[PDB]
Write a protein that binds this ligand. Structure first.
Ligand SMILES: Cc1cc2nc3c(=O)[nH]c(=O)nc-3n(C[C@H](O)[C@H](O)[C@H](O)COP(=O)(O)OP(=O)(O)OC[C@H]3O[C@@H](n4cnc5c(N)ncnc54)[C@H](O)[C@@H]3O)c2cc1C
Ligand SMILES: Cc1cc2nc3c(=O)[nH]c(=O)nc-3n(C[C@H](O)[C@H](O)[C@H](O)COP(=O)(O)OP(=O)(O)OC[C@H]3O[C@@H](n4cnc5c(N)ncnc54)[C@H](O)[C@@H]3O)c2cc1C
Ligand SMILES: Cc1cc2nc3c(=O)[nH]c(=O)nc-3n(C[C@H](O)[C@H](O)[C@H](O)COP(=O)(O)OP(=O)(O)OC[C@H]3O[C@@H](n4cnc5c(N)ncnc54)[C@H](O)[C@@H]3O)c2cc1C
Ligand SMILES: Cc1cc2nc3c(=O)[nH]c(=O)nc-3n(C[C@H](O)[C@H](O)[C@H](O)COP(=O)(O)OP(=O)(O)OC[C@H]3O[C@@H](n4cnc5c(N)ncnc54)[C@H](O)[C@@H]3O)c2cc1C
Ligand SMILES: NC(=O)c1ccc[n+]([C@@H]2O[C@H](COP(=O)([O-])OP(=O)(O)OC[C@H]3O[C@@H](n4cnc5c(N)ncnc54)[C@H](OP(=O)(O)O)[C@@H]3O)[C@@H](O)[C@H]2O)c1
Ligand SMILES: NC(=O)c1ccc[n+]([C@@H]2O[C@H](COP(=O)([O-])OP(=O)(O)OC[C@H]3O[C@@H](n4cnc5c(N)ncnc54)[C@H](OP(=O)(O)O)[C@@H]3O)[C@@H](O)[C@H]2O)c1
Lengths: 427, 427, 427, 427
């Protein structure tokens, strides 16, 4: 009836945690999630889309390579590992990541699907957390009791403030695939934003720009179509060492950095930029292309015209000028935002909050005052750019398991980098 | 005393693998013997820069069982450095690290007996099992081991063309290179004979220092071209169970005019290195003509050591059907390795099937005997082709060995890999 | 009225020769061709197809980088060189090569289109060649007199002997693009052969294998889907040095080699093999693919069935078995064959012939007995695998111009390779 | 005597370019003066392995005129080696070859005067032209040159932080490195200060030999990361006339908080090298912990030379706002180059427009004067941005210089390049 911990969302981070926590003698854990199964970014799962991270950043390998949930074992189980060996590609197709997480989810015993947690509270008598769910299929109430909670509810698709009207006219990157036909039949399309999502889509639509007749535009507030910096000395910043350093900085300094370091976690894989460019070059060989590409351009307002068009007021923040552009179809590749879910109100008072009323996460990813309520991927403001990285999932899950059980279930490296991040006098 | 299910004689990579795959198999009682005091693998051609030509998934166990604790990835984890390796992002291990990894695996195993020279092996009719006579090399103690089955991975040995036996005191085989590098760099002139990978790693190493010491640096080989090892992915399907079960459709040794015909599938230099070699000649040449020669299609038929203080190499340019001669003080004979049955095998001579040439006439499941109990690792260049020296096909073979030794599939064996169909097949 | 030389075809080789010969003081040359303009392999000109050779193997640069016909100048003239610089890709799209040769052809003054030469003779009185043309548009006869002739009439699309019936049912690689729609609407397609043409098409059709419903088969007589060997030490074989060596071999030995060295000039760009494999892997993620891929399989016969199908009798030459396969659509990527054109009869007697009744080409590409009748790309049997290489076009054109004018108009390197090809004794 | 249309003072690459582009222009009478006895370009940071970060098309002339005989490709042809370079297939020239190429261009030009130190420059009111006073360095002879216009490409000079002036006798700037390599490798400890490309080429060079000599090898820089130079193709559009004519929309020096903000577009290390550096640390570490440190975000504020026999470096970790100190025997100060106006320019001080800081307030066509007749090469880091030190934008500038010097477009100037639109623009 009582669990050592209850894990509240089931995305890749909690799924990881589940695969890691299943084999631990003396640990009862359970993971709730409101959907019927694992399905991860179904709407940006393009046929030629792959992860930004090598396959060793699967569910378990960075913490335990021997785990049967490893992507390589997965491959062995489907009798295709030898083909994966021949492929010799560190980067899984997103479709395969998904098929693999699904496999892991079927195999696990600790997951409870179709279970929407509606409310969470602290019972002062019992000294434990009380989690109220609703079966999404049947209505049934349940309560789940646990000493510790970990939240990986995920963040949520975000569109600019000035577009909550018109929402039914545009498509947010996340829904791109469902609406891809509806878009290609328009005569002009525009993608708004410069993240990897934005780029994969822009590439997708370019592939067919002379199959259909469209104009393909790309506008963003970002100064450049920048690459995710992936050179090996910078990849050391993704390390326990660096997280310590970053966590220990002043809280303004962190937020300051997180907006200044967007090229460490938000940019476009550099092969794709180049592929896009090479494709514009190839397409141009037939005749001039109807493409427009703008930079430094914030969407300040939009409006819907009579004939069946948008008019996008933008503002060029570097040369301080405003301007107007129009487009039949629109793809809002503006990314995602966390917001503490509804249920958190019930424990809301027991969670520590910072000046901006966000979780005041501690180095061990705890938000309560007693190391029982943890978060996954709500720490961008407090642990830095490494927070959403599937390749630091095992590391977090390992510091979690160390807090939840008393002990270092999975060894957690203290430093792996050749460089030294903070100031350190010699002697 | 007790009769082992199998004994493995020789702890090369192939038996070291079979050891790690054997260890945790329930009711398998087997043991591995080797002379050497621990694991080492050709420490005298192992240059700072060298590395394996296969991805790291062709480690001791992973292509049969990714969950094994003897996996490379796990070694890396246990050593404290998997994040660094994740940053490295390189399918190819440095030969020195493969070496440390194997040593760590061997130190962790329990089924290996080091310092155990095998002197003689016989079949004990009266007991109906094999009798293996060993010397403990550190005590001197003789000892006898009983086994129903033997798996021999003794490994091949350093080889030079017949015509060179008299000068073996002076020329240095590739295995002896690092130990004489300093010696050879003092000569006026060095020549590197043979155009496999060993030769090229060396030729590159020496070219590096050519502007710095005297020398003339020559490269001569019998081969037609300095050909690359064919690494295109359609062709690696031929290193697969399907292609090996295809190769088991008897041309009864017209598979042997195939084995010299399919030269560039298992011999041949790494593409990168060939190009590296070229780019280096280019860079050195920016300072002057390079005293280099590079010949090709040339069999070394005779050799002599002039009173002058130089070799004279008699070469036969085989395509032009024309003979020539060249000279050289230093001489690195990069002509490979060849398998001869060890001493201890006279003891079961009459028990072993022989090929018309006194090669083990290896059966399809790797047995040399009549009753499926004496097996061999990589003495089948003639029976299984270009694929017998590949660390990638190690787990496949060890898996079929354990099906035979055990009677049951222990590690499944992926036959659903190749897109190609290899045999004729009708519709 | 009289020309120093008349150039009979206008493909890339004679077009090159034309750009090179135009600026030479004291040289009157003229190039006839029966089509209305330059259009080069229109039917294999896929959108993502590019040359196998870097852009410095354009019309002129390997002989004169300062020529205004250089691909880079071309780029400058269209005001897009800075974009070509950003692209940083040595390999022109085939579409761009074409647009560029067309540009060069407009610019030239020495080309005569719509002129089919029907007959050629030696006038014994005049001591010169007499070339009879027909204007393809208007019927008009003309005669052109020249001292020397050079023939770059091109080779011709070839299909296996056993298919001259059925010719109207299949598509030869050369016509692929016109018939691409007609093929994609079939339910099964097969490509016959393993050259670069075969591969580009197989890739093309795979891109859409789940857009349409087809089965995509690939069958070839070749042992493997082999790569064109492009490693830099082998690329030295494409050199004056090597051609000397090769030309000087016995004529059986050459033919022998030309069939043994098909991987030097006939194979698939290795990126494409791998791309094809990666695409089979990606496509397979959705469900098993209806693809079949056969090797060592000669098409011995074919026949057309009632319902609307082919039945291809093949013969697996390695395991000596015949078999039968069927396919609605068929793409015959069997390449091309030279045959001396009709007009050569008129000079036929003055040309030297070899044992097999092919031009007995001399080192300077002459076929007459007096160094006045030259060929371009009819020397495979006598100059080797480098014959069709656009990157040796400038070299040939340069030895031609040296013979035609008295003198070395464009310097012709005697050796550029670090290695030495023939036997060469030291002293 | 005669008054030149322009005189160029300093024969760096930029004026060497303008020389080659100027030479064949009809009715342009101009000449170039330099002290040095011939061309050399920083011979003491030029390591066997170094190479340019730009493709070879950014040679002296090709981006303005591919037909020029001063093109690299033509140099390669004239030297007898273009086939080798075609085999090399490498957009990036070795720094030693760029050097030989420029020297060959300069030896072939007629408009350069070497050994011609320019002592003083004045405006002769009475003649209405500029007066340039020179010393012939080999005769001693004073001499005076007249010119309507001056183009100054004197080049910047080696720079160290202010706080180091006292120890300049002991530490070695990157320019002096090869000459003290042997000296520095004898020390216990070496430190490399600065994280541009120079630093990295050096840091790599030294790491190479780290296992071989004593040393501790440190790397410290002010920069936040060891960032790569941004080479993604969408971003190289910003190095283009369009982006430079965009940059000519006055923020009147808010383009100066851009110039430190756009650090990684023109400073920053080659991607490959960063990774190379990492892979080498990895390989060396296979033998032991490496005595290396690498610090970042650290301004060198003070420095001192202890009696002990060591420097003590006072560093300020700027992000952590914390001071520290480190020590080192050897010290390579890889801190770059800075432009100060030369001596001879006092002579036209009142004639030159100055930026509020005594920098030439460079006008849009590169003029420093009021009457469009004194021009400058690469003293505009503030007026034209990240693009002023790029050999790729050399031909662009020399082309606009020759429009001004000449009144007519001599070499067109490609403004139809970028797919991006850079300024705001409405629809
Ligand atoms: C499109 C995209 C692609 C990415 N690709 C990469 C990559 O290649 N490499 C990399 O390192 N990082 C990547 N990231 C970063 C990261 O994976 C995601 O931002 C995101 O965090 C997905 O993981 P998650 O576990 O946090 O959340 P989710 O996948 O959102 O998991 C949360 C789940 O819980 C559910 N839920 C919410 N509330 C409740 C409730 N009360 N009860 C029950 N269930 C609930 C949700 O609907 C969902 O099923 C990517 C991100 C996105 C958005
Ligand atoms: C240097 C080298 C590098 C290679 N790299 C690659 C690669 O990157 N990729 C690839 O696919 N293939 C590679 N190969 C091919 C293949 O790995 C080898 O040729 C060899 O077959 C592998 O070793 P083994 O297990 O057969 O035995 P070995 O490595 O030769 O070792 C076997 C042991 O047998 C012992 N022994 C002999 N007699 C006795 C006795 N009487 N008693 C006890 N012990 C005895 C020896 O002391 C030795 O330790 C490589 C081969 C070599 C030689
Ligand atoms: C599809 C294809 C792709 C290739 N790609 C590459 C590559 O990327 N790189 C490379 O190095 N090599 C390549 N090659 C090799 C080579 O370019 C071709 O095989 C072929 O030789 C084209 O050049 P050509 O000048 O010989 O002939 P063609 O292009 O055939 O030129 C001959 C012309 O003369 C005409 N003609 C014939 N008879 C007469 C007559 N009596 N009167 C007037 N005109 C006549 C023809 O119809 C034609 O216009 C390729 C070859 C093919 C077939
Ligand atoms: C080492 C180095 C490598 C670089 N590599 C690249 C690269 O790969 N890609 C890229 O895009 N950018 C590169 N740059 C950036 C740029 O090329 C340089 O910083 C510099 O501006 C180029 O030289 P310059 O033509 O300005 O003059 P310099 O190279 O400095 O030479 C100019 C000459 O001025 C002479 N001089 C000075 N005073 C007098 C006088 N009174 N009389 C006569 N002569 C005088 C000097 O003797 C010298 O010969 C590099 C820069 C340096 C310094
Ligand atoms: N591996 C994969 O296959 C994959 C695929 C998709 C996504 N992802 C990941 O998911 C996360 C988010 O990716 P994403 O592309 O969805 O989102 P993102 O990187 O947050 O995209 C935000 C983009 O939208 C722009 N934007 C926001 N508001 C705007 C406005 N008003 N006007 C104009 N532009 C505006 C942003 O500019 P600013 O930069 O100024 O905000 C930025 O360029 C990252 O962790 C990323 O790596 C990964
Ligand atoms: N750069 C480019 O974009 C490009 C594109 C297309 C072509 N090309 C060039 O054009 C030339 C020819 O190219 P290609 O692909 O058109 O022709 P090719 O290389 O001559 O193709 C012949 C292929 O067809 C097979 N074949 C012939 N007869 C057969 C039979 N009866 N049964 C089964 N298979 C049979 C051949 O096998 P065998 O090997 O046993 O003969 C071979 O695999 C080359 O110089 C090539 O590089 C270049």
């Amino acid at each position: 009836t009582i669990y050592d911990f209850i894990g509240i969302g089931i995305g890749p981070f909690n799924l990881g945690l589940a695969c890691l926590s299943e084999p631990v003698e003396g640990l009862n854990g359970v993971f709730l999630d409101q959907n019927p199964g694992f399905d991860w970014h179904t709407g940006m799962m393009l046929e030629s889309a792959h992860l930004q991270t090598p396959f060793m950043a699967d569910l378990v390998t960075l913490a335990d390579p021997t785990s049967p949930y490893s992507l390589l074992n997965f491959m062995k189980q489907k009798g295709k590992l030898y083909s994966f060996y021949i492929r010799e590609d560190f980067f899984l197709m997103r479709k395969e990541y998904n098929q693999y997480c699904q496999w892991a989810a079927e195999r696990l015993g600790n997951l409870r699907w179709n279970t929407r947690v509606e409310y969470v509270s602290y019972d002062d008598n019992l000294q434990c957390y009380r989690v109220r769910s609703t079966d999404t299929v049947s209505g049934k109430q349940q309560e789940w009791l646990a000493h510790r909670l970990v939240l990986g509810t995920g963040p949520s698709a975000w569109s600019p403030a000035c577009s909550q009207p018109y929402r039914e006219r545009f498509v947010h990157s996340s829904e791109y695939l469902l609406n891809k036909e509806k878009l290609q039949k328009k005569r002009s399309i525009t993608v708004l934003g410069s993240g990897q999502s934005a780029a994969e889509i822009y590439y997708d639509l370019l592939t067919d720009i002379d199959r259909f007749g469209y104009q393909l535009n790309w506008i963003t507030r970002a100064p450049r179509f920048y690459p995710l910096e992936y050179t090996k000395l910078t990849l050391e910043m993704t390390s326990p060492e660096w997280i310590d350093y970053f966590h220990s900085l002043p809280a303004a300094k962190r937020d300051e950095l997180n907006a200044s370091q967007k090229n460490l976690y938000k940019g476009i894989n550099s092969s794709l930029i180049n592929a896009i460019y090479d494709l514009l070059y190839v397409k141009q060989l037939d005749g001039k292309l109807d493409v427009n590409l703008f930079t430094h351009s914030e969407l300040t307002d939009m409006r819907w015209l009579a004939e069946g068009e948008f008019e996008l007021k933008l503002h060029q923040q570097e040369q301080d000028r405003a301007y107007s552009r129009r487009t039949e179809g629109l793809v809002m590749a503006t990314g995602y935002h966390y917001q503490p879910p509804a249920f958190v109100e019930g424990i809301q008072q027991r969670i520590q909050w910072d000046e901006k009323d966000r979780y005041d996460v501690q180095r061990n990813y705890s938000i309560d005052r007693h190391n029982q309520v943890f978060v996954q991927n709500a720490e961008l403001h407090t642990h830095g750019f490494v927070t959403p990285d599937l390749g630091m999932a095992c590391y977090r899950n390992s510091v979690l398991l160390r807090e939840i059980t008393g002990r270092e279930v999975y060894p957690v490296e203290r430093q792996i980098a050749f460089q030294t991040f903070p100031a350190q006098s010699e002697m």
